[PDB]
Structure formats: structure tokens, C-alpha cells
């Protein structure tokens, strides 16, 4: 859905999520942590679950693995974002992916 675009911009700007930072704000290029199991701070994934209504505090049982898969899939299938594959660093101690936000009119 198109709701991811503005929400993710707001989360980067907020500075609440360590590692979710602008790399070049003027070109709308940002880093997002991309860790593997082996907590990893699921705060960003839980926030997306609450925002879309897939989770209710104290009613639904928490499911961090499913929350993580669901946000990663939304980003990968979105036409508003493009991974800069040659910039991502998946095999280091603090791994991350780099994405660019596609300007309106280019999509």
C-alpha cells in the first residue's frame, strides 16, 4: 500500500530507531538495519504492526518474527522505494541495506 511511503519517512526523521538514518537526505537515500536471528530490537517492526492494525496491545499475542517478515516484504514490494544493492552491507557486525525513495512522476 501507499501508506508505507510517508510513514517510513517519518520514522527516519524521528531518530527513534538506531541505525535508521539518512545517508543523503537531499537525495532521499537512507540506511535500514538488516540483522539476522543470532533481542534485535523489534521496535520498528512492532510500530508498523500497530499502525496497520495487525496488533492490539494486551489483546493479541506478540509475534516479532511475523512482524519482521511483514515489514520487510512491504518494503521489497513497494514502488516508492528502490534498494541500492551495491551500497548494502549484509555481512558485517552491524549490517544494513540502503534504499532510495522514488520521486513522484518517476514511477
Q: Is 58 left (phi over 0), alpha (psi -120 to 50) or beta?
A: left
Q: Which residues pair with 30 in a beta bridge?
A: 22, 99
Structural domain contains residue 107: no
| Overall domain count for the chain | 1
In the 8-state DSSP scheme, what is residue 4? H
Experimental method: X-ray
Q: Grid coordinates standing for 70?
A: 511483514
Alpha-carbon span 61 to 56, nearest angstrom: 9
Range of the domain at 51: 3-102
Overall size of the chain counted in residues = 107
Direct distance between the N- and C-terminal alpha carbons of the chain, in angstroms, rounded to an integer: 14
The alpha carbon torsion through 21, 91, 49, 104 (nearest 10 deg) reads 50
Q: Grid coordinates standing for 14?
A: 524521528
Amino acid at each position: 500500500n501507499g501508506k508505507l511511503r510517508q510513514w517510513l519517512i517519518d520514522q527516519i526523521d524521528s531518530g527513534k530507531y538506531p541505525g535508521l538514518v539518512w545517508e543523503n537526505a537531499a537525495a532521499s537515500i537512507f540506511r535500514i538495519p538488516w540483522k539476522h536471528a543470532g533481542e534485535e530490537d523489534a521496535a520498528l517492526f512492532k510500530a508498523w504492526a500497530l499502525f496497520k492494525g495487525k496488533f492490539r496491545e494486551g489483546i493479541d499475542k506478540p509475534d516479532p518474527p511475523t512482524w519482521k517478515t511483514r515489514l520487510r516484504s512491504a518494503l521489497n514490494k513497494s514502488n516508492d522505494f528502490e534498494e541500492l544493492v551495491e551500497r548494502s552491507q549484509l555481512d558485517i557486525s552491524d549490517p544494513y541495506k540502503v534504499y532510495r525513495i522514488v520521486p513522484e512522476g518517476a514511477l
